[PDB]
Amino acid sequence: QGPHMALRKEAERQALAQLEKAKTKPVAFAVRTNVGYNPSPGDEVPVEGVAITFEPKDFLHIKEKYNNDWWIGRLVKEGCEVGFIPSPVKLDSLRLLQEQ
Amino acid sequence: TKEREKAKSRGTFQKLREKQQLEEDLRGYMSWITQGEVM
Amino acid sequence: VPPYDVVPSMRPIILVGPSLKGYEVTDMMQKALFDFLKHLFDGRISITRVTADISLARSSLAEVQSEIERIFELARTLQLVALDADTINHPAQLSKTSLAPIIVYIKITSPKVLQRLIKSRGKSQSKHLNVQIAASEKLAQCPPEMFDIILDENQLEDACEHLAEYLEAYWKATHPPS
């Protein structure tokens, strides 16, 4: 409600400034994916709409680490920008949430 | 024209195709050594 | 099973195995293919010579990992990496490490012309007739989609058109515009 929108709306704009200030940062490390994943509405995304998706055997140039559940990085593709990469503990959290 | 069909139908098409493509692959395989003979 | 594996930020370009390496044939047909790699991306490429077998992670573990971490240093400045390997002769040979190189395949389109290259290098290479094309037919037992870049163009300007435009399309994919 009104008491829940004071902190939820202030965290989306705070995470969007972190995403916008990380495109000029150099690439720290790249990862090689093994499974497929797509963004959904209930994945606890900080900025809903700026998430990226990856299929199996794709490449992700991770820029920095946002938190313990989401990374900041871009997809190796012509024209793609930075996005939210799920951490390996987030991929472990998304699989056990489907069973519970 | 009826004789080029009977030279199509004996064996003679490959002679100007294989030896053509055995020549252009010969000239191309020479560049893969001789461009490394210099630098 | 880990979903993510630590790979370098820039993949090393690997001119590997048209015929089997370690001869006057494949090495000096690959040595020619670093001459066009010398000045074409000059200033945005790192050309080195690979000596140790990097398919073990012979040489020990310390001498190989120090060369793998050297490739890790060359991907920090976001530039292209080229490897002059003399032992790599299959895509699956470099599928167990944490590098994932670009399997550039110099393609031999006709095996019958390959035994005539053996007769053209004198009588020194003529004693290695069937063993070279054997695993260079097991480089045909590989499916072609297991590679990354395949070069079947015979002329120099036609084979280097795929060599330059594919890495330029890969350069724009790794580096976004401002």
CA distance A57 to A37: 11
- Residue A45's nearest CA partner among A76, A11, A22 is A11
Question: Which residue among C28, C113, C116 sits closest to B33, beta carbon to beta carbon?
Answer: C28
Q: Is C39 in contact with C164 (CB distance < 8 Å)?
A: no
Which of B26, B31, B37 comes nearest C156 by C-beta?
A: B31
- How far A22 CA lies from chain C's nearest CA (Å)? 12
Closest C-alpha to C93, from C128, C46, C57, C63: C57
Task: Round to whole Å and give the CA distance between B13 and B11.
Answer: 6
Q: For residues C61-84, b (16+ Cβ closer than 10 Å) or e, as one string?
A: eeebbebeeebbebbeeeebbbbb
Q: How was this structure determined?
A: cryo-EM
Q: Residue A20 belongs to what domain range?
A: 1-100
Residue C147 near residue C105 (C-beta atoms within 8 A) = yes
- Indicate the pairing of strand A29-32 with strand A59-65: antiparallel
Question: For A82-100, b where at least 16 C-beta lie within 10 A, e where not — what string?
Answer: bbbbbbeebbeebeeeeee
- Containing A86, the helix (H) or strand (E) segment is strand A82-86
Q: Resolution of the deposited coordinates, in angstroms?
A: 2.9
CB contact under 8 A, C9 and A27: yes
CB contact under 8 A, B31 and C155: yes
Residue B15 neighbours by CB distance under 10 Å: 10
* C118-155 per-residue burial string, b: 16 or more CB within 10 A, e: under 16: beeeeeebeebeeebbebbeebeebeeeebbbebebbe
B34: left (phi over 0), alpha (psi -120 to 50) or beta: alpha
Cβ–Cβ < 8 Å for A53, A37:
yes
Closest CA to A69 of A92, A87, A42, A48: A87
User: What's the structural domain count of chain A?
Assistant: 1
Neighbours of chain B (3+ CB pairs under 8 A): C
C41-C44-C45 Cα angle (round to 5) = 75
Q: How far apart are CA B25 and CA C4, in angstroms?
A: 43
Strands C149-151 and A70-75: unpaired
Q: Sign of the C-alpha dihedral, residues A7, A13, A19, A21?
A: negative
Six-digit token string for A33: 């994916």
Contact assignment for C169 to A27 by CB distance below 8 Å: no
Asked if C18 contacts C136 with a C-beta cutoff of 8 angstroms, the reply is yes
Please give the Cα distance from A91 to A77 (Å, whole number). 23
Lookup result for tokens 């992700």: A60
Asked if C103 contacts C148 with a C-beta cutoff of 8 angstroms, the reply is yes
CA distance A7 to chain C (A): 32
Q: Using an 8 Å CB-CB cutoff, list chain A residues near C5.
A: 31-32, 34
| Separation CA C7–CA C41 (nearest Å) | 23
Query: C111-118 vs B15-34: helix axis angle to the nearest 10?
Result: 50
Listed in sequence order, the DSSP H helices in A1-100 are 5-20, 88-99
The CA–CA distances, whole Å, from A79 to A10, C59, C148 equal 29, 42, 21
Which among A4, A78, A13 is positioned nearest to A50, based on CA atoms? A13
* Residues of chain C neighbouring B31 (CB-CB closer than 8 A): 32, 155-156
CATH number of domain containing A68: 2.30.30.40
Q: Are the C-beta atoms of residues C146 and C91 closer than 8 Å to each other?
A: yes
Name which of C7, C75, C174 is nearest A31 (Cβ-Cβ). Answer: C7
To 5 degrees, how large is the angle CA A1–CA A18–CA A95? 70
- Residue in A35, A41, A39, A42 with CA at minimum distance from that of residue A84: A39
C29 touches chain B (CB under 8 A): yes
Nearest to B24 among C35, C38, C154 (CB): C154
Instruction: Give first-to-last CA distance, chain A, whole Å.
Output: 27
User: What gap in Å lies between CA C154 and CA B27, rounded to an integer?
Assistant: 8
Sign of the dihedral through C-alpha B13, C107, C157, C168:
positive
The 3-state DSSP class for residue C150 equals: strand
Interface check C40 vs B, CB under 8 A: no
Distance of CA C50 to the CA centre of its chain: 11
- C178 CA: distance to closest CA in chain B (Å): 37
Q: Which chains touch A (3 or more CB pairs under 8 A)?
A: C
End-to-end CA distance of chain C: 37
Q: Between B15-34 and C156-174, two packed helices, what is the crossing angle to 10 degrees?
A: 60
C109 touches chain B (CB under 8 A): yes
Rounded to whole angstroms, the Cα distance separating C9 from A78 reads 16
Beta strands in C126-165 (DSSP E): 149-151
CA dihedral sign of residues A75, C72, C147, B33? positive
Whether chain A lies against chain C with 3 or more Cβ pairs closer than 8 A is yes
Domain architecture of chain C: domains with CATH = 1-178 (3.40.50.300)
One-character DSSP codes across C70-132: HHHHHTTTT-EEEEE-SS---GGGGSSSS---EEEEE--S-HHHHHHHHTTS-SSGGG-HHHH
Q: Which residue has the tokens 């880990």?
A: C2
Residue A29, C-beta contacts closer than 8 angstroms, at least 6 positions apart: A62, C6, C9
Cα(A88)–Cα(A93) distance, integer angstroms: 9
Q: Which long-range contacts (CB under 8 A, 24 or more apart) does A78-81 make?
A: A78/C169, A78/C172, A78/C173, A79/C176, A80/A52, A80/C176, A81/A23, A81/C176
| Cβ neighbours of residue A17 closer than 8 Å, sequence gap 6 or more | none
Q: To the nearest 10°, report the CA torsion of B29, B33, B34, B36.
A: 140
